[PDB]
Amino acid sequence: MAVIKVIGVGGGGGNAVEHMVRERIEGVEFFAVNTDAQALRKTAVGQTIQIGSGITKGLGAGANPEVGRNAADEDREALRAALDGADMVFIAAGMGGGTGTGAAPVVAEVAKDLGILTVAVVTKPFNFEGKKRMAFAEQGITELSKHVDSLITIPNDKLLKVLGRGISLLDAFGAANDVLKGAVQGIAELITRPGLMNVDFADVRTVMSEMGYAMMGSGVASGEDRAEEAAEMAISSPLLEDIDLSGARGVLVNITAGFDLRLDEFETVGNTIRAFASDNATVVIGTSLDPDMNDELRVTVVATGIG
Amino acid sequence: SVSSVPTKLEVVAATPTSLLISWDAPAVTVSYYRITYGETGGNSPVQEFTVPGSKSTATISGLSPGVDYTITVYARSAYHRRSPISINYRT
Ligand SMILES: Nc1nc2c(ncn2[C@@H]2O[C@H](COP(=O)(O)OP(=O)(O)O)[C@@H](O)[C@H]2O)c(=O)[nH]1
Protein backbone atom coordinates (compact mmCIF):
# COMPACT_ATOMS: atom_id res chain seq x y z
CA MET A 1 0.00 0.00 0.00
CA ALA A 2 3.01 2.34 0.21
CA VAL A 3 3.53 4.42 -2.92
CA ILE A 4 7.12 4.95 -4.08
CA LYS A 5 7.87 7.20 -7.02
CA VAL A 6 11.23 7.76 -8.72
CA ILE A 7 11.79 10.98 -10.70
CA GLY A 8 14.54 11.06 -13.28
CA VAL A 9 15.23 14.80 -13.46
CA GLY A 10 17.19 15.96 -16.48
CA GLY A 11 18.81 14.15 -19.34
CA GLY A 12 21.07 11.96 -17.27
CA GLY A 13 18.45 11.53 -14.58
CA GLY A 14 16.09 10.07 -17.16
CA ASN A 15 19.00 7.92 -18.35
CA ALA A 16 19.31 6.26 -14.94
CA VAL A 17 15.56 5.85 -14.53
CA GLU A 18 15.27 4.35 -18.01
CA HIS A 19 17.83 1.80 -16.85
CA MET A 20 15.89 1.20 -13.61
CA VAL A 21 12.77 0.72 -15.72
CA ARG A 22 14.49 -1.80 -18.00
CA GLU A 23 16.18 -3.64 -15.13
CA ARG A 24 12.99 -3.42 -12.99
CA ILE A 25 12.64 -2.15 -9.46
CA GLU A 26 9.69 -3.90 -7.88
CA GLY A 27 6.66 -2.00 -6.57
CA VAL A 28 7.73 1.55 -7.48
CA GLU A 29 6.49 4.11 -10.05
CA PHE A 30 8.96 5.72 -12.49
CA PHE A 31 8.67 9.26 -13.88
CA ALA A 32 10.94 11.15 -16.30
CA VAL A 33 11.26 14.93 -15.99
CA ASN A 34 13.25 17.06 -18.42
CA THR A 35 13.13 20.14 -20.62
CA ASP A 36 14.42 18.39 -23.77
CA ALA A 37 11.19 17.27 -25.45
CA GLN A 38 13.06 15.26 -28.12
CA ALA A 39 14.80 12.87 -25.72
CA LEU A 40 11.61 12.92 -23.62
CA ARG A 41 9.86 10.73 -26.23
CA LYS A 42 12.96 8.65 -27.07
CA THR A 43 12.65 6.95 -23.68
CA ALA A 44 10.31 4.14 -22.68
CA VAL A 45 9.73 5.33 -19.12
CA GLY A 46 5.94 5.55 -19.44
CA GLN A 47 5.50 8.86 -17.56
CA THR A 48 6.98 11.86 -19.37
CA ILE A 49 6.88 15.40 -17.91
CA GLN A 50 8.46 18.38 -19.65
CA ILE A 51 9.03 21.38 -17.40
CA GLY A 52 8.21 24.62 -19.18
CA SER A 53 5.68 24.45 -21.98
CA GLY A 54 6.57 28.11 -22.46
CA ILE A 55 9.75 29.21 -20.64
CA THR A 56 11.42 26.68 -22.93
CA LYS A 57 10.36 25.93 -26.51
CA GLY A 58 10.77 22.18 -26.13
CA LEU A 59 14.51 22.76 -26.70
CA GLY A 60 17.20 21.85 -24.14
CA ALA A 61 18.64 24.19 -21.51
CA GLY A 62 22.24 23.40 -22.45
CA ALA A 63 24.53 23.53 -19.37
CA ASN A 64 21.85 25.98 -18.22
CA PRO A 65 21.08 25.97 -14.47
CA GLU A 66 19.48 29.42 -14.38
CA VAL A 67 16.47 28.91 -16.65
CA GLY A 68 16.60 25.21 -15.84
CA ARG A 69 15.54 26.32 -12.36
CA ASN A 70 13.05 28.74 -13.95
CA ALA A 71 11.81 26.10 -16.42
CA ALA A 72 10.92 24.03 -13.36
CA ASP A 73 9.42 26.98 -11.45
CA GLU A 74 6.95 27.40 -14.37
CA ASP A 75 4.86 24.23 -14.00
CA ARG A 76 5.13 23.57 -10.24
CA GLU A 77 1.54 22.43 -10.86
CA ALA A 78 2.51 19.79 -13.43
CA LEU A 79 4.88 18.41 -10.79
CA ARG A 80 2.36 18.51 -7.95
CA ALA A 81 -0.30 16.38 -9.61
CA ALA A 82 2.12 13.68 -10.67
CA LEU A 83 3.38 13.55 -7.06
CA ASP A 84 0.04 13.42 -5.27
CA GLY A 85 -0.56 10.35 -3.15
CA ALA A 86 3.13 9.50 -2.74
CA ASP A 87 4.53 8.37 0.57
CA MET A 88 8.08 8.45 -0.84
CA VAL A 89 9.85 10.04 -3.82
CA PHE A 90 13.29 9.41 -5.27
CA ILE A 91 14.68 12.29 -7.32
CA ALA A 92 17.45 10.89 -9.54
CA ALA A 93 19.40 13.56 -11.36
CA GLY A 94 22.75 14.05 -13.00
CA MET A 95 24.26 16.97 -11.19
CA GLY A 96 26.27 19.67 -12.94
CA GLY A 97 24.04 19.70 -16.00
CA GLY A 98 21.60 22.39 -16.82
CA THR A 99 18.02 21.17 -16.65
CA GLY A 100 18.92 18.70 -13.90
CA THR A 101 20.71 21.10 -11.56
CA GLY A 102 17.93 23.70 -11.50
CA ALA A 103 14.80 21.55 -11.53
CA ALA A 104 15.81 18.89 -9.00
CA PRO A 105 15.77 21.41 -6.09
CA VAL A 106 12.47 22.72 -7.41
CA VAL A 107 11.12 19.19 -7.87
CA ALA A 108 12.26 18.40 -4.32
CA GLU A 109 10.59 21.51 -2.88
CA VAL A 110 7.18 20.54 -4.27
CA ALA A 111 7.34 16.99 -2.88
CA LYS A 112 8.45 18.44 0.45
CA ASP A 113 5.42 20.76 0.56
CA LEU A 114 3.09 17.87 -0.25
CA GLY A 115 4.55 16.11 2.82
CA ILE A 116 6.21 13.41 0.68
CA LEU A 117 9.37 11.80 2.06
CA THR A 118 11.89 13.32 -0.32
CA VAL A 119 15.18 11.51 -0.98
CA ALA A 120 17.40 13.00 -3.68
CA VAL A 121 20.01 10.73 -5.30
CA VAL A 122 22.43 12.69 -7.48
CA THR A 123 25.89 12.35 -9.04
CA LYS A 124 28.87 14.77 -8.83
CA PRO A 125 30.49 15.00 -12.30
CA PHE A 126 33.76 13.38 -13.29
CA ASN A 127 37.22 14.80 -13.95
CA PHE A 128 37.09 14.91 -17.78
CA GLU A 129 33.83 16.80 -17.19
CA GLY A 130 35.81 19.82 -15.93
CA LYS A 131 35.69 22.48 -13.22
CA LYS A 132 32.76 24.62 -14.47
CA ARG A 133 30.57 21.50 -14.41
CA MET A 134 31.69 20.29 -10.99
CA ALA A 135 31.33 23.72 -9.37
CA PHE A 136 27.87 23.88 -10.95
CA ALA A 137 26.97 20.69 -9.05
CA GLU A 138 28.05 22.25 -5.77
CA GLN A 139 25.50 25.03 -6.16
CA GLY A 140 22.83 22.49 -7.00
CA ILE A 141 23.61 20.28 -4.02
CA THR A 142 23.48 23.24 -1.62
CA GLU A 143 20.26 24.43 -3.25
CA LEU A 144 18.93 20.86 -3.15
CA SER A 145 19.84 20.48 0.54
CA LYS A 146 17.32 23.18 1.55
CA HIS A 147 14.44 21.12 0.19
CA VAL A 148 15.05 17.41 0.96
CA ASP A 149 14.87 15.13 3.95
CA SER A 150 17.96 13.21 2.79
CA LEU A 151 20.43 14.00 0.01
CA ILE A 152 22.62 11.09 -1.07
CA THR A 153 25.62 12.43 -2.96
CA ILE A 154 27.65 10.01 -5.07
CA PRO A 155 30.76 11.62 -6.61
CA ASN A 156 31.54 10.06 -10.00
CA ASP A 157 35.26 10.44 -9.42
CA LYS A 158 34.94 7.54 -6.98
CA LEU A 159 33.91 5.23 -9.85
CA LEU A 160 37.25 5.55 -11.68
CA LYS A 161 38.69 3.36 -8.89
CA VAL A 162 36.58 0.39 -10.10
CA LEU A 163 36.44 1.38 -13.79
CA GLY A 164 39.17 -0.36 -15.73
CA ARG A 165 41.44 1.14 -18.36
CA GLY A 166 40.18 1.76 -21.85
CA ILE A 167 36.56 1.83 -20.75
CA SER A 168 34.75 4.30 -23.00
CA LEU A 169 32.64 7.30 -22.05
CA LEU A 170 29.49 5.19 -22.40
CA ASP A 171 31.02 2.68 -19.95
CA ALA A 172 31.78 5.37 -17.34
CA PHE A 173 28.18 6.47 -17.72
CA GLY A 174 26.08 3.33 -17.49
CA ALA A 175 28.27 2.74 -14.44
CA ALA A 176 26.77 5.91 -12.91
CA ASN A 177 23.29 4.68 -13.85
CA ASP A 178 23.97 1.69 -11.59
CA VAL A 179 25.07 3.60 -8.50
CA LEU A 180 21.93 5.73 -8.74
CA LYS A 181 19.84 2.57 -9.20
CA GLY A 182 21.54 0.80 -6.31
CA ALA A 183 20.92 3.80 -4.08
CA VAL A 184 17.21 3.62 -4.94
CA GLN A 185 16.93 -0.17 -5.05
CA GLY A 186 18.69 -0.72 -1.71
CA ILE A 187 16.34 1.68 0.09
CA ALA A 188 13.04 0.96 -1.62
CA GLU A 189 13.34 -2.83 -1.26
CA LEU A 190 13.08 -2.73 2.52
CA ILE A 191 9.56 -1.58 1.76
CA THR A 192 8.77 -3.51 -1.42
CA ARG A 193 10.53 -6.87 -0.87
CA PRO A 194 10.78 -7.08 2.92
CA GLY A 195 12.49 -10.01 4.58
CA LEU A 196 12.23 -11.60 7.98
CA MET A 197 13.62 -8.66 9.91
CA ASN A 198 11.64 -5.99 8.22
CA VAL A 199 12.09 -2.22 7.95
CA ASP A 200 8.68 -0.62 7.48
CA PHE A 201 8.20 2.88 6.09
CA ALA A 202 8.03 4.60 9.49
CA ASP A 203 11.42 3.17 10.44
CA VAL A 204 12.62 4.63 7.11
CA ARG A 205 11.09 8.08 7.61
CA THR A 206 12.85 8.15 10.96
CA VAL A 207 16.40 7.47 9.73
CA MET A 208 15.94 9.74 6.73
CA SER A 209 13.55 12.68 7.38
CA GLU A 210 14.94 16.21 7.90
CA MET A 211 18.40 14.66 8.01
CA GLY A 212 20.21 16.32 5.10
CA TYR A 213 23.43 15.00 3.64
CA ALA A 214 23.78 11.24 3.15
CA MET A 215 26.23 8.73 1.64
CA MET A 216 26.00 5.02 0.86
CA GLY A 217 28.10 1.90 0.19
CA SER A 218 27.43 -1.72 -0.89
CA GLY A 219 29.05 -5.14 -0.78
CA VAL A 220 28.46 -8.67 -2.05
CA ALA A 221 30.08 -11.88 -0.99
CA SER A 222 29.43 -15.61 -1.16
CA GLY A 223 30.64 -18.62 0.72
CA GLU A 224 31.20 -19.07 4.41
CA ASP A 225 32.31 -15.49 5.14
CA ARG A 226 29.74 -13.70 2.98
CA ALA A 227 28.45 -11.69 5.94
CA GLU A 228 31.75 -10.48 7.41
CA GLU A 229 33.02 -9.74 3.93
CA ALA A 230 29.97 -7.99 2.44
CA ALA A 231 29.84 -5.79 5.57
CA GLU A 232 33.56 -4.99 5.24
CA MET A 233 33.10 -4.09 1.58
CA ALA A 234 30.17 -1.82 2.51
CA ILE A 235 31.78 -0.08 5.47
CA SER A 236 34.97 0.28 3.34
CA SER A 237 33.25 1.32 0.14
CA PRO A 238 34.86 4.24 -1.72
CA LEU A 239 31.42 5.84 -2.31
CA LEU A 240 31.44 6.25 1.49
CA GLU A 241 35.11 7.18 1.81
CA ASP A 242 34.82 10.85 2.75
CA ILE A 243 32.57 10.23 5.76
CA ASP A 244 33.25 9.47 9.38
CA LEU A 245 30.69 6.69 9.64
CA SER A 246 30.72 7.53 13.38
CA GLY A 247 29.66 11.11 12.63
CA ALA A 248 26.29 10.42 10.97
CA ARG A 249 23.01 11.14 12.70
CA GLY A 250 21.66 7.88 11.24
CA VAL A 251 22.62 4.58 9.62
CA LEU A 252 20.18 2.48 7.53
CA VAL A 253 21.34 -1.06 6.73
CA ASN A 254 19.75 -3.43 4.20
CA ILE A 255 20.84 -7.08 4.18
CA THR A 256 19.65 -8.62 0.92
CA ALA A 257 19.65 -12.43 1.05
CA GLY A 258 17.36 -15.30 0.21
CA PHE A 259 16.10 -17.59 3.00
CA ASP A 260 19.40 -19.34 3.87
CA LEU A 261 20.46 -16.27 5.94
CA ARG A 262 21.77 -17.47 9.29
CA LEU A 263 20.83 -15.97 12.65
CA ASP A 264 24.54 -15.33 13.34
CA GLU A 265 25.14 -13.77 9.94
CA PHE A 266 22.61 -11.09 11.00
CA GLU A 267 24.63 -11.00 14.25
CA THR A 268 27.83 -10.37 12.32
CA VAL A 269 26.45 -7.60 10.08
CA GLY A 270 24.80 -5.94 13.05
CA ASN A 271 27.77 -5.85 15.40
CA THR A 272 30.16 -4.73 12.66
CA ILE A 273 27.81 -1.80 11.95
CA ARG A 274 27.27 -1.03 15.65
CA ALA A 275 31.05 -0.77 16.11
CA PHE A 276 31.56 1.78 13.33
CA ALA A 277 28.54 3.96 14.20
CA SER A 278 27.72 6.18 17.17
CA ASP A 279 25.90 4.56 20.10
CA ASN A 280 23.41 7.45 19.95
CA ALA A 281 22.70 7.38 16.20
CA THR A 282 19.40 6.13 14.78
CA VAL A 283 20.60 2.66 13.66
CA VAL A 284 18.15 0.64 11.61
CA ILE A 285 19.23 -2.80 10.42
CA GLY A 286 16.89 -5.11 8.53
CA THR A 287 16.68 -7.53 5.60
CA SER A 288 15.08 -7.69 2.18
CA LEU A 289 14.24 -11.04 0.60
CA ASP A 290 15.42 -12.26 -2.81
CA PRO A 291 14.48 -15.94 -3.07
CA ASP A 292 16.61 -16.25 -6.25
CA MET A 293 19.68 -15.80 -4.01
CA ASN A 294 21.56 -18.77 -2.60
CA ASP A 295 24.81 -18.88 -0.59
CA GLU A 296 25.40 -15.19 -1.35
CA LEU A 297 24.74 -11.98 0.57
CA ARG A 298 24.37 -8.29 -0.18
CA VAL A 299 24.71 -5.48 2.36
CA THR A 300 23.76 -1.85 1.72
CA VAL A 301 24.66 0.97 4.10
CA VAL A 302 23.38 4.53 3.94
CA ALA A 303 24.83 6.99 6.47
CA THR A 304 22.34 9.83 7.02
CA GLY A 305 22.68 13.21 8.67
CA ILE A 306 26.36 13.40 7.85
CA GLY A 307 26.37 17.19 7.37
CA SER B 1 23.77 -1.95 -26.40
CA VAL B 2 23.83 -5.19 -24.34
CA SER B 3 22.40 -4.77 -20.85
CA SER B 4 23.94 -7.73 -18.96
CA VAL B 5 27.31 -8.44 -17.36
CA PRO B 6 29.18 -10.31 -18.65
CA THR B 7 28.18 -9.02 -22.12
CA LYS B 8 29.76 -11.81 -24.19
CA LEU B 9 29.93 -15.51 -23.39
CA GLU B 10 31.16 -18.44 -25.50
CA VAL B 11 32.57 -21.95 -25.18
CA VAL B 12 36.19 -21.79 -26.32
CA ALA B 13 37.29 -25.37 -25.67
CA ALA B 14 34.79 -28.19 -25.97
CA THR B 15 35.40 -31.87 -25.27
CA PRO B 16 32.30 -34.11 -24.90
CA THR B 17 32.41 -34.12 -21.09
CA SER B 18 33.97 -30.77 -20.12
CA LEU B 19 33.82 -27.18 -21.37
CA LEU B 20 36.03 -24.09 -21.05
CA ILE B 21 33.73 -21.06 -21.23
CA SER B 22 35.05 -17.55 -21.70
CA TRP B 23 33.51 -14.11 -21.25
CA ASP B 24 34.51 -10.49 -21.72
CA ALA B 25 36.42 -8.36 -19.27
CA PRO B 26 33.99 -6.14 -17.30
CA ALA B 27 34.08 -2.35 -17.44
CA VAL B 28 33.36 -2.37 -13.69
CA THR B 29 35.10 -4.46 -11.02
CA VAL B 30 33.41 -7.79 -10.36
CA SER B 31 33.84 -9.37 -6.92
CA TYR B 32 33.04 -12.92 -8.09
CA TYR B 33 31.00 -14.82 -10.68
CA ARG B 34 28.04 -17.13 -10.14
CA ILE B 35 28.17 -19.92 -12.71
CA THR B 36 25.17 -22.22 -13.29
CA TYR B 37 24.53 -25.00 -15.78
CA GLY B 38 21.79 -27.54 -16.42
CA GLU B 39 20.21 -29.56 -19.20
CA THR B 40 18.00 -27.23 -21.21
CA GLY B 41 14.56 -28.02 -19.82
CA GLY B 42 15.26 -30.01 -16.68
CA ASN B 43 13.65 -30.62 -13.31
CA SER B 44 16.92 -31.28 -11.47
CA PRO B 45 18.20 -28.21 -9.59
CA VAL B 46 20.88 -26.41 -11.57
CA GLN B 47 24.48 -26.82 -10.45
CA GLU B 48 26.40 -23.67 -9.53
CA PHE B 49 29.87 -22.56 -8.34
CA THR B 50 31.88 -19.33 -7.92
CA VAL B 51 35.11 -18.18 -9.58
CA PRO B 52 37.04 -15.07 -8.43
CA GLY B 53 36.10 -11.81 -10.12
CA SER B 54 39.54 -11.64 -11.67
CA LYS B 55 38.63 -14.61 -13.89
CA SER B 56 37.30 -14.52 -17.46
CA THR B 57 37.15 -18.31 -18.05
CA ALA B 58 35.57 -21.23 -16.27
CA THR B 59 35.81 -25.01 -16.58
CA ILE B 60 32.56 -26.95 -16.34
CA SER B 61 33.52 -30.60 -15.90
CA GLY B 62 31.59 -33.86 -15.73
CA LEU B 63 29.20 -33.20 -18.62
CA SER B 64 27.14 -35.75 -20.53
CA PRO B 65 28.18 -36.05 -24.20
CA GLY B 66 25.63 -35.00 -26.79
CA VAL B 67 23.44 -33.55 -24.03
CA ASP B 68 21.99 -30.07 -24.46
CA TYR B 69 23.04 -27.62 -21.74
CA THR B 70 22.20 -24.08 -20.66
CA ILE B 71 25.03 -22.13 -18.96
CA THR B 72 24.52 -18.89 -17.04
CA VAL B 73 27.19 -16.52 -15.68
CA TYR B 74 26.22 -13.87 -13.12
CA ALA B 75 28.67 -11.10 -12.40
CA ARG B 76 28.35 -10.00 -8.77
CA SER B 77 29.69 -6.52 -8.29
CA ALA B 78 29.15 -4.17 -5.38
CA TYR B 79 28.58 -1.41 -7.97
CA HIS B 80 25.58 -2.82 -9.81
CA ARG B 81 22.93 -5.53 -9.89
CA ARG B 82 23.31 -6.26 -13.58
CA SER B 83 21.68 -9.17 -15.21
CA PRO B 84 23.38 -12.38 -16.38
CA ILE B 85 24.27 -13.65 -19.85
CA SER B 86 23.51 -17.16 -21.08
CA ILE B 87 24.33 -19.69 -23.83
CA ASN B 88 23.40 -23.26 -24.85
CA TYR B 89 25.73 -26.14 -25.76
CA ARG B 90 25.70 -29.78 -26.89
CA THR B 91 28.51 -32.24 -26.09
N1 LIG C 1 24.18 8.24 -14.93
C1 LIG C 1 24.13 9.17 -15.92
N2 LIG C 1 24.71 10.39 -15.70
C2 LIG C 1 24.68 11.36 -16.66
C3 LIG C 1 24.00 11.05 -17.92
N3 LIG C 1 24.11 12.15 -18.70
C4 LIG C 1 24.79 13.09 -17.99
N4 LIG C 1 25.14 12.63 -16.77
C5 LIG C 1 25.88 13.45 -15.77
O1 LIG C 1 25.17 14.67 -15.54
C6 LIG C 1 25.97 15.81 -15.85
C7 LIG C 1 25.15 16.68 -16.80
O2 LIG C 1 24.47 15.94 -17.81
P1 LIG C 1 22.88 16.05 -17.97
O3 LIG C 1 22.17 15.43 -16.79
O4 LIG C 1 22.41 15.42 -19.26
O5 LIG C 1 22.55 17.63 -18.06
P2 LIG C 1 21.04 18.13 -17.82
O6 LIG C 1 20.11 16.99 -18.13
O7 LIG C 1 20.74 19.29 -18.74
O8 LIG C 1 20.93 18.54 -16.36
C8 LIG C 1 27.27 15.33 -16.45
O9 LIG C 1 28.40 15.86 -15.73
C9 LIG C 1 27.24 13.82 -16.32
O10 LIG C 1 28.28 13.38 -15.43
C10 LIG C 1 23.42 9.69 -18.11
O11 LIG C 1 22.82 9.36 -19.18
N5 LIG C 1 23.52 8.84 -17.07
Numbering used by the authors:
A (entry chain A): 10 to 316
B (entry chain B): 0 to 90
Task: Please give me the paper's original passages concerning this structure.
The structures of the two crystal forms (P212121 and P21) of the KpFtsZtr–Mb and EcFtsZtr–Mb complexes were determined using molecular replacement with the KpFtsZtr crystal structure (Protein Data Bank (PDB) code: 6LL528) as the reference, at resolutions of 2.20 and 2.50 (KpFtsZtr–Mb) and 1.84 and 2.60 Å (EcFtsZtr–Mb), respectively. FtsZ in the P212121 and P21 crystals of the KpFtsZtr–Mb and EcFtsZtr–Mb complexes all showed the R conformation, and the crystals contained one and three complex molecules per asymmetric unit, respectively. The superposition of the Cα atoms between the P212121 and P21 KpFtsZtr protofilaments composed of three KpFtsZtr molecules indicates that the protofilament of P21 KpFtsZtr is curved. The protofilament in the P21 crystal structure represented a moderate curvature smaller than that of the double-helical tube structures. In the KpFtsZtr–Mb complex, the Mb interacted with the central helix (H7 helix), the H6-H7 loop, and a β-sheet in the CTD. The binding region of Mb was distant from the GTP-binding site of FtsZ, which is consistent with the finding that the GTPase activity of KpFtsZ was not mostly affected by Mb binding.
FtsZ is a tubulin homolog GTPase protein that is widely conserved in bacteria and plays a key role in a complex called divisome, which carries out cell division. FtsZ polymerizes into protofilaments to form the Z-ring that acts as a scaffold for accessory proteins during cell division. FtsZ treadmilling, a motion in which the protofilament polymerizes in one end (plus-end) and depolymerizes in the other end (minus-end), drives cell wall synthesis that constricts the Z-ring to form a septum of the cell. In order to aid high-resolution structure determination of the FtsZ protofilament, we developed a monobody (Mb) that binds to both KpFtsZ and EcFtsZ with high affinity.
